[PDB]
Curated annotation (Swiss-Prot), chain B:
Residues 1-302 are cytoplasmic. The active site is at residues 41, 145. Residues 1-302 form the Peptidase C30 domain. It comes from the Viruses. Cleaves the C-terminus of replicase polyprotein at 11 sites. Recognizes substrates containing the core sequence [ILMVF]-Q-|-[SGACN]. May cleave human NLRP1 in lung epithelial cells, thereby activating the NLRP1 inflammasome pathway. Also able to bind an ADP-ribose-1''-phosphate (ADRP). May cleave host ATP6V1G1 thereby modifying host vacuoles intracellular pH. It is found in: Host cytoplasm; Host Golgi apparatus. It catalyses: TSAVLQ-|-SGFRK-NH2 and SGVTFQ-|-GKFKK the two peptides corresponding to the two self-cleavage sites of the SARS 3C-like proteinase are the two most reactive peptide substrates. The enzyme exhibits a strong preference for substrates containing Gln at P1 position and Leu at P2 position. Monomer. Homodimer. Only the homodimer shows catalytic activity. This is 3C-like proteinase nsp5. The gene is rep.
């Protein structure tokens, strides 16, 4: 059961390279606006304690060079929106797909189109961690790469990369320039807090297993929500809330397995392990597939 | 930082996918310039698939027998022909989204990206490796007949695989873009034994190098080994024999890291003999074999 990324073409046609002085990163070109991390105007030293409004004042439209493939896009306006720099260009992107900007919740997944200087390099699937960071792969020059989900013909952009954290983990913002987590675009001592396993997703994944005929772990018992959390939280799992139970409703109905009964199976797996067995071919409980990813991938259409 | 299984951006291939229908059978086709490529078994009903004679089946069709659609728009077929296990359909219009491309046949162990499609529409992309036994793992190849596998070098798409069959016993089988099957499989719905599979040693060693350039290093040790002695151990764990050619391939990664290939083989030998003791590497609890040395150099350098 592979984790798949969404087809990246629609986002590929929106990536450009933005350069301010000696700094270069990626930008997202939708209609006549290019969005990129505001720190593109910062040098490393400015990162110590930047006065963005002040730094942006000393910049003019000509301060930004925007390249779309072999084409230089003329910048005719700039401004800041939270942690994002917005650059108006004289040409509306002919490849602009139907889109939306959305702020994702911890635990939810999305695809990331890793780019290097405006040029798409690879695509992978990942999840927003409960601690608000993402475990990804961003080499030199990937800042500005974006995360997204596609629904039908609509691209829902939900993430833009800004920083690498001491852990080698990453931090960034939604497309309104608002950081996920307490993080900030400047050099501070900030670090990711302890993370937990995304219980909602592990349960989703166990439903996926059952849907695919791998069900040796099911049992004849059930559990109270509170009794489940009492055990699971001991194994560093996120507490399961009533809202999470409701979110698993469709999967519960499709399989005829009440959520608390699936919780009893999970409790047993955590307390007794798998005993050499595997689930969906895995020897480990997967936590980066959401209930929606399962429905999407098992109900295809 | 971080290390993820990464697929190539799929847009260049998305712009080439179409739907091909014959009678009541529909699957995906690849449209480049004025030609559409698809599995020849598009001409077969499920019953034909029990023991088809493609010659016989094909001579019974005409250009009008094929309905190809790009989205909801029909592309008129003006010619057809069979090339090994592929059906080639000439259409009256050219695909302006055709990228610079090449058709290549890869060797077992190599990786590529597959754009899973259904009825000619892009569904998802994933990275995989051609197993030593020529099958490919991925419950996701189900119903995606005609979906293709590829790698991208700069602006050039190197197509290397077309999905054809679901192998009763799991895994899927397919062909290169010349219509030649990978493996001892055939274009027919019969039980076909998939040879024994092995772990791709060359790739595991590349992945351990990845862990080292990424700061993992607990698995290293002070020993070394001869290639010969390494194989005597690895081959007991169902690992592919390692050759000097494979060791030479690891040279660059060895140069980076400053860890000799055979010393890394010595680390692996220990890993196979004493398991990982609950510890992890690059976040995984098992030795990963679907990243080639090239993949590693690509994701770890630039």
């Amino acid at each position: 059961f592979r984790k798949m990324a969404f087809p990246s073409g629609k986002v590929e046609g929106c990536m450009v390279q933005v350069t301010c002085g000696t700094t270069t990163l990626n930008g997202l070109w939708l209609d006549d606006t290019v969005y990129c991390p505001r720190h593109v105007i910062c040098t490393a030293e400015d990162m110590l304690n930047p006065n963005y409004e002040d730094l942006l004042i000393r910049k003019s439209n000509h301060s930004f060079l925007v390249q779309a493939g072999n084409v230089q896009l003329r910048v005719i306006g700039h401004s800041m929106q939270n942690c994002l720099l917005r650059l108006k260009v004289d040409t509306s992107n002919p490849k602009t797909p139907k889109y939306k900007f959305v702020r994702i919740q911890p635990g939810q997944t999305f695809s990331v189109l890793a780019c290097y200087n405006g040029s798409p390099s690879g695509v992978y699937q990942c999840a927003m961690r409960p601690n608000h960071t993402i475990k990804g792969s961003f080499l030199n020059g990937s800042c500005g790469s974006v995360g997204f989900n596609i629904d039908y013909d609509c691209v829902s952009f939900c993430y833009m990369h800004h920083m690498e954290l001491p852990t080698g983990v990453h931090a960034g913002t939604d497309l309104e320039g608002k950081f996920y987590g307490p993080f900030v675009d400047r050099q501070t001592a900030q670090a990711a807090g302890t993370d937990t396993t995304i219980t909602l997703n592990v349960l989703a994944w166990l439903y996926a297993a059952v849907i695919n005929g791998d069900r040796w772990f099911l049992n004849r018992f059930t559990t109270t929500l509170n009794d489940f959390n009492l055990v699971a939280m001991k194994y560093n799992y996120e507490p399961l809330t009533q809202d999470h139970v409701d979110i698993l409703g469709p999967l519960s109905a499709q399989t005829g397995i009440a959520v608390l009964d699936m919780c009893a199976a999970l409790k047993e797996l955590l307390q007794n392990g798998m005993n050499g067995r595997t689930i969906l071919g895995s020897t480990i409980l997967e936590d980066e597939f959401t209930p929606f990813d399962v429905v999407r991938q098992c109900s295809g259409v």
